[PDB]
Design an enzyme around this catalytic site. Structure first.
Site, mmCIF file in Angstrom:
data_model
loop_
_atom_site.group_PDB
_atom_site.id
_atom_site.type_symbol
_atom_site.label_atom_id
_atom_site.label_comp_id
_atom_site.label_asym_id
_atom_site.label_seq_id
_atom_site.Cartn_x
_atom_site.Cartn_y
_atom_site.Cartn_z
ATOM 1 N N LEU A 162 0.798 -1.218 0.000
ATOM 2 C CA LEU A 162 0.000 0.000 0.000
ATOM 3 C C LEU A 162 0.833 1.272 0.000
ATOM 4 C CD1 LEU A 162 -2.689 -1.101 2.615
ATOM 5 C CD2 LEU A 162 -3.003 -0.924 0.138
ATOM 6 N N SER A 189 10.066 6.497 4.755
ATOM 7 C CA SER A 189 11.332 6.547 5.476
ATOM 8 C C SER A 189 11.207 6.057 6.914
ATOM 9 C CB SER A 189 11.892 7.970 5.449
ATOM 10 O OG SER A 189 13.130 8.043 6.135
ATOM 11 N N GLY A 221 -9.775 6.710 1.752
ATOM 12 C CA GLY A 221 -8.468 7.182 1.340
ATOM 13 C C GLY A 221 -7.929 8.277 2.235
ATOM 14 N N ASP A 232 4.580 14.316 15.812
ATOM 15 C CA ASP A 232 4.540 14.152 14.369
ATOM 16 C C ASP A 232 3.314 14.860 13.807
ATOM 17 O OD1 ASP A 232 4.557 13.429 11.747
ATOM 18 O OD2 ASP A 232 4.408 11.264 12.082
ATOM 19 N N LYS A 290 1.742 15.684 9.596
ATOM 20 C CA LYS A 290 1.900 15.785 8.152
ATOM 21 C C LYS A 290 0.570 15.436 7.502
ATOM 22 C CE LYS A 290 3.791 11.084 7.906
ATOM 23 N NZ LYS A 290 4.259 10.768 9.283
ATOM 24 N N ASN A 319 -0.860 11.866 7.843
ATOM 25 C CA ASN A 319 -1.436 11.426 9.114
ATOM 26 C C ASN A 319 -2.898 11.850 9.238
ATOM 27 O OD1 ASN A 319 1.077 10.400 9.623
ATOM 28 N ND2 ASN A 319 1.615 11.886 11.219
ATOM 29 N N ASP A 367 0.286 6.643 12.832
ATOM 30 C CA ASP A 367 1.641 6.918 13.297
ATOM 31 C C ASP A 367 1.614 7.630 14.643
ATOM 32 O OD1 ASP A 367 4.341 7.167 13.515
ATOM 33 O OD2 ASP A 367 4.620 8.444 11.751
ATOM 34 N N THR A 409 7.895 17.762 11.649
ATOM 35 C CA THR A 409 7.535 18.829 10.725
ATOM 36 C C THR A 409 8.788 19.549 10.243
ATOM 37 O OG1 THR A 409 7.079 20.171 12.690
ATOM 38 C CG2 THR A 409 5.191 19.218 11.530
#
Lengths: 310, 162, 310, 162
Positions: free
Chosen positions: C9, C13, C86, C126, C128, C131, C144, C161
């Site tokens: 999927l 990193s 999605g 975290d 982004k 997420n 995450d 970030t």
């Protein structure tokens, strides 16, 4: 294969170019391989034939020599004189922007080559900053001439690059000179502002900017060329003041352009304003650190009956 | 519609604030002249990180700064490998080449200014540049380990002392 | 020997999310796989140890109830719930401009999840666009959570970030949970203007734009959003709206949230504006595709004591 | 400083309508219903190519059109081969999955709205992206060969006569 190779010199859509040493004399020269793969996959024999017919009887200071040309059963290698120095785009990107004399000399050379091509009825077609070579003696040379035409006539060819087009080429309209002039109006921009002219993440924006002629006055720009840039973009060409058929009685009588002693420039005597620093045979400090790809020689005959004119 | 971009994870080195033991003042010692120190200070003042630092930290970094002499045709730093050093071109000119889809395109050089690999100290990332020698010169700077250690020590001292 | 993989999927990193199916009952689910080879070089056991406790620290609908993990000789696996829908980043890139109801719903969900995370005093760390997943039930979920951690003192692990980093942390200094809003505030720009926030590629330009307090306001923003963006412009964000007693007064009483009702969403009973199409099980058409990559690692122990707690 | 994208050529077949081919007036009109033409004109009267065009050329382009019924799940176009067709958004949901560096990503789903594929008519360019059909539908398969030939022939005739 009477040439000992050393190291590759460049790879791209135009083809491959390597460095060779003349076995009969011992001198560094450039060897461009036609490959023919992309030519057969994209149909580009007409441009090669036109370039060959032009070079058959054309020679000027702003041209590369044609010394020995080799055709094999399925490949072709054109030999040319190597000019250690590198392209000016690299130095422009390393520094940032040049001064007014540099742009003046560039425009002088551009008009000179334009007049030289018009003297024998020729069209440069493609024009990009990656086709310039500066030697140590100041003699500038131009490369990549496959995009040309024998006689202007009135065709409807479509090529070049998206970053150098005009509404006349998007819908073919002859553009006997607009493609070589309108786009030129943006070239100076690349050598003036601190960033590339076109900066967009989609070709639609580039097309809209090309169609909508409007130059964005940079925050730091000389007021002399401001008026010229405010009018370089136009639809037709007869309305342009400085656009005489002679091309010498218009740029010399300009505001900033006045002391452009073309008599001393066309004769190759005045030194360039920026000479590259040499070191040894075949310098590489000015060139990039590109590596060599997988080379392959010929095996058998596959498309040797293409250029059946020699 | 848009060229778009990747969303790769980013990283930075960790530290143990509970570990208060460290060096007495500095490991590397190399006091230079007054003109060189003034030039280095003037070149560092142009950096954003040195806008809020006090004279004490500046003097500490100057005393702990490390100088490296690079001759002609020398090569040590290379792309791809994990970056673990940092230097500043004190004099001369050295062109830096960065990869561009299998082509080490040039970016430029520096003359008594700049900072090759200034972002490498902000986070651990592979080498995104390539340096090449040209003439004998000297580069002043400090590796990432010692720089981060000194920064964290100063931060802890300023946080706990008050 | 329980869950069998199907296809990939998406890898990054840190880990690789893939689709798996149970051998007993049989149901499609998501599984994140990680390799200790990259963690041993970077040494990030503190961030991974937080997941061992986050697996149990879940007592709310938004908090995704992670499944039991499994550590191998040189690989770790963690099963989670399935997301037939999605990600929000893909939908934003496809559209690029939400309406008023959709923007209000997104802001309400953001406020709700922020309040939920602050109630437990768990630093999100975290942040982004990746997420933020859209489940088939018509809700939003976060992924995450290993970066989460609650320490009495300060911290210095800079990771999460890199681009949307406030000028208070770029200088290697402390920070609070309020920064989570700033790093997300710029995101609202993408859902208002139509283009990314930073119109450059070099990190230097991004840092200069972040430090330079200046944000454009095209003719497409709302009335309250303009004032909210103008109020937050100084470099040293000292008058933050999140750093308050309860942290749910000035933001809720603002003109932007003229009508809100968190009690309706607390029990989960409000249909979303537009739920992604659910074409039965295995509807992976909404998610982005990726090349298949099997596990090609030798079965050999590599530091077991370092990964005891799991 | 920047990734610096390449600048490859954009050459194509030099169509010289003067002494090429043997046939003449090869229009090959394909009439259809009136409602479909009226619905397609609303979108055809807004493209950069049709914003400044003679009514005769627009009518000829609207009359000349071929339909193709595409069912659910059919990889008719894939990123790799050369591109010679102009697909019009008639009806049905179609996902545009581009292989960004070998990774599939949805660019912009088209549902009886918008316009795409015109870039293929600008020059010789490969397939833009994979057009996945989520449900049955009827698309318009306009090849590149037809568009330049009459569009240049009419202009040449007008310049020769007018």
């Amino acid at each position: 294969d009477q040439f000992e190779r050393i190291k590759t010199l460049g790879t791209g859509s135009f083809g491959r170019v390597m460095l060779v040493k003349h076995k009969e004399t011992g001198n560094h020269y450039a060897m461009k391989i036609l490959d023919k793969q992309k030519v057969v996959k994209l149909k580009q024999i007409e441009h090669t034939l036109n370039e060959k017919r032009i070079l058959q009887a054309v020679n000027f200071p702003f041209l590369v020599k044609l010394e020995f040309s080799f055709k094999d059963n399925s490949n072709l290698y054109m030999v040319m004189e190597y000019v250690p120095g590198g392209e000016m785009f690299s130095h422009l990107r390393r520094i940032g922007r040049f001064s007014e004399p540099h742009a003046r000399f560039y425009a002088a050379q551009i008009v000179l080559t334009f007049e030289y091509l018009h003297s024998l009825d020729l069209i440069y077609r493609d024009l990009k900053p990656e086709n310039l070579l500066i030697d140590q003696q100041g003699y500038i040379q131009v490369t990549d001439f496959g995009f040309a035409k024998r006689v202007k006539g009135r065709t409807w060819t479509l090529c070049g690059t998206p970053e150098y087009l005009a509404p006349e080429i998007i819908l073919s309209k002859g553009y006997n000179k607009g493609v070589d002039w309108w786009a030129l109006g943006v070239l100076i921009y690349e050598m003036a502002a601190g960033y590339p002219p076109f900066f967009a993440d989609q070709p639609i924006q580039i097309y809209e900017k090309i169609v909508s002629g409007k130059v964005r006055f940079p925050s730091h720009f000389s007021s002399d060329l401001k008026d010229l840039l405010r009018n370089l973009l136009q639809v037709d060409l007869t309305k342009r003041f400085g656009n005489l058929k002679n091309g010498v009685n218009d740029i010399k009588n300009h505001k900033w352009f006045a002391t452009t002693d073309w008599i001393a420039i066309y004769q190759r005597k005045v030194e360039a304003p920026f000479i590259p620093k040499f070191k040894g045979p075949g310098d590489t400090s000015n060139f990039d650190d590109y590596e060599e790809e997988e080379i392959r020689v010929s095996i058998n005959e596959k498309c040797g009956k293409e250029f059946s004119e020699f | 519609i848009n060229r778009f971009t990747r969303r790769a994870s980013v990283c930075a080195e960790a530290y143990n604030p509970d570990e208060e033991e460290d060096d007495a003042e500095s490991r590397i010692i190399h006091p230079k002249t007054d003109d060189q120190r003034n030039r280095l200070q003037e070149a560092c003042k142009d950096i954003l990180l040195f806008k809020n630092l006090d004279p004490e930290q500046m003097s500490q970094v100057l005393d702990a700064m490390f100088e490296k002499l690079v001759k002609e045709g020398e090569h040590v730093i290379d792309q791809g490998d994990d970056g673990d050093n940092f230097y500043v071109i004190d004099r001369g000119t050295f062109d830096i080449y960065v990869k561009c889809d299998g082509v080490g395109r040039c970016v430029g050089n520096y003359d008594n200014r700049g900072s090759f690999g200034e972002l490498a100290l902000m986070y651990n990332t592979p080498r995104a540049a390539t340096i090449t020698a040209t003439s004998p010169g000297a580069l002043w700077g400090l590796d990432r380990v010692t720089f981060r250690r000194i920064i964290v020590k100063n931060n802890a001292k300023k946080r706990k002392m008050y």
